[PDB]
Amino acid sequence: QGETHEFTAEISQLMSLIINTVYSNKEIFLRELISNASDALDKIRYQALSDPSQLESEPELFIRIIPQKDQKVLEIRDSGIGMTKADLVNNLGTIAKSGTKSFMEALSAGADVSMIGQFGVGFYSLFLVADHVQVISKHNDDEQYVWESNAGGKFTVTLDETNERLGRGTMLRLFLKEDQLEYLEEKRIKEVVKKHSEFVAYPIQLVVTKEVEK
């Protein structure tokens, strides 16, 4: 049962600018997505200070980076607060009109793309390196859902009957552009994390797949 919705026009505008830009420091996407993961983790930690049972759906607080080399997919998972079905539609497809408009005006004046997070729309920096995204999310109030976008004017939201259970939190699945496959490599990911994400209150875990040889 796929629900199709329309992006706020300005968000569609910004996605087109980002997916097409030749900006040369694309690695900042990972900084922005780790920062958003950290924010989501802050929110569940805040709720858990009042009500520790909110953590029972996934007791550990983490950010986890999972390259899927054969799929040409980079996954970025957190155990933050998650998004309900109603959220995903709102947080990603509709709200942040203000930040997107302000950021585009800043771009026209000369702003560096790397300041995208100062406008609150750093999520959309993922289109620097990906041409398609799935956002899998699980909030304590709700079932697990998948939100999906190709940087065009529409997105879908579907009950998640095909991905691993998250317990609680959000996983972005970035379908990388053909010239951006360096962000599947352990050494490259580590470099970017260490350079840009030193001040993060949660462990940043890197999942690496190695052949056992003798």
Author numbering: 5 to 218
From the primary publication:
We obtained structures for the domain under three conditions: apo (unliganded), in complex with ADP, and in complex with the prototypical inhibitor radicicol. Despite the presence of different ligands, overlay of the three crystal structures showed an almost identical conformation for this domain with a root mean square deviation (r.m.s.d.) of 1.32 Å or less over all atoms. Nonetheless, localized structural differences between the apo and liganded complexes were observed in the loop between α-helices 4 and 5 (residues Gly97 to Thr104), a region on the edge of the ATP binding site. Overall comparison between both human apo structures (open and closed) and the fungal N-terminal domain showed no major differences, with main-chain atom r.m.s.d. of 1.02 and 1.15 Å, respectively. Importantly, however, the region spanning residues Asp91 to Gly97 of C. albicans NBD in its apo state was seen in two conformations. We hypothesized that this observation might result from greater flexibility within the fungal ATP-binding site than was immediately obvious, an increased flexibility that might contribute to observed differences in the intrinsic ATPase activity of the fungal and host homologs.
Hsp90 is essential in all eukaryotes where it regulates the form and function of diverse client proteins, many of which are key signal transducers. Hsp90 enables drug resistance via multiple molecular mechanisms, most notably through the stabilization of the stress-activated protein phosphatase calcineurin and multiple components of Pkc1 mitogen-activated protein kinase (MAPK) cell wall integrity pathway. Hsp90 also serves as the previously enigmatic thermal sensor that controls temperature-dependent morphogenetic switching in C. albicans, a key factor contributing to the organism’s virulence. To identify potentially exploitable differences in the Hsp90 expressed by a fungal pathogen vs humans, we determined the crystal structure of the C. albicans Hsp90 N-terminal domain, which includes the nucleotide-binding pocket targeted by all Hsp90 inhibitors in clinical development.
